[PDB]
Assembly symmetry: D3
Homo-oligomer: 64 residues x 6
Amino acid sequence: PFINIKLVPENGGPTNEQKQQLIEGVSDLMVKVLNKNKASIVVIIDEVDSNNYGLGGESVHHLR
Amino acid sequence: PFINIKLVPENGGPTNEQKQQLIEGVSDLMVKVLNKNKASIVVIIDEVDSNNYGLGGESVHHLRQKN
Amino acid sequence: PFINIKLVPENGGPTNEQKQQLIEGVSDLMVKVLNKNKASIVVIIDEVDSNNYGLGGESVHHLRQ
Amino acid sequence: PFINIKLVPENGGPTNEQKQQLIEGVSDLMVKVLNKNKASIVVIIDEVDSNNYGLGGESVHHLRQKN
Amino acid sequence: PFINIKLVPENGGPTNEQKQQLIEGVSDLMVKVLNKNKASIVVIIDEVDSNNYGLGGESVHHLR
Amino acid sequence: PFINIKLVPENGGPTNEQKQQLIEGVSDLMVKVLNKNKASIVVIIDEVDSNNYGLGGESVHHLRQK
């Protein structure tokens, strides 16, 4: 299975350690809930600039 | 944040309950690791046909038909 | 430019005429805002099942109760 | 609803102002045509280098040098 | 590497054989130009209705 | 059609010339296999940081590239 996560960096995060936790956690979720093979799981994390992510018509930067 | 999950159905699954567990699981995960707001988390699950998902240069339909 | 739209169908929609209005709509916007050549604009629309869309930790299906 | 826009930056654009215009415009369109709840609309703008975008078999960058 | 292909079905196609040709062709190109590891390559093909794909302001369906 | 390629840069690559090959290569494949008109093919290449790509529960960076 493929998992794509797009998030807006906030207050000095995410760190490489938190990224690892996200990767391992979503991966284990597929195993425990769907009994999937862990080795074939691909996860990609995209960090979006605050000025390029909109929620409810406003940029997250504006909202911040 | 935004999370997109693409997977191949198998042995009758996934059910709506398992899908609900996946939605709840990934959300709680974002909260636990990044302390993000649960309310604004969007999750989309795409179910892909075994003949349209390729791993290593071969479709999953072929792989599943082995062992 | 490329534009991808993912939405959950609802109350019979969206119809083909509606999908056409979205295509023409986002296309003109690009010309107006960035003066892009309309000829090279590509738009893709994806429909997602209520049991497959989550918002706030619950499926859209459950939210619709 | 979720919207993802990918474009090649050109002649000093797009500006943060121009980006907001795109976010606002796209969101309004979704309300105008589908009567969707504006509060839950997510839009993401990706900016791509002229060398990483292809059209008709050539990079946007090469197309420009031809003119 | 991950490759996503999106196309509008036409004149009966694409068949599963053509899908396999795309899956392998894309994979081979990655190994050939960048010498990537073939086993870890993931490819996903999305088939899009002609009423959901637009070019130059019109849907592929109207294009006539 | 539309083709999106996501990869992790490795050992001084990919170069613009390589990206051109990838663009032309993917485009020719659509022409040959599906008989598409070249002019309408759009290809986008995304370069992903090794600490952001996960495989089998670990990151490409931890696996030491790919």
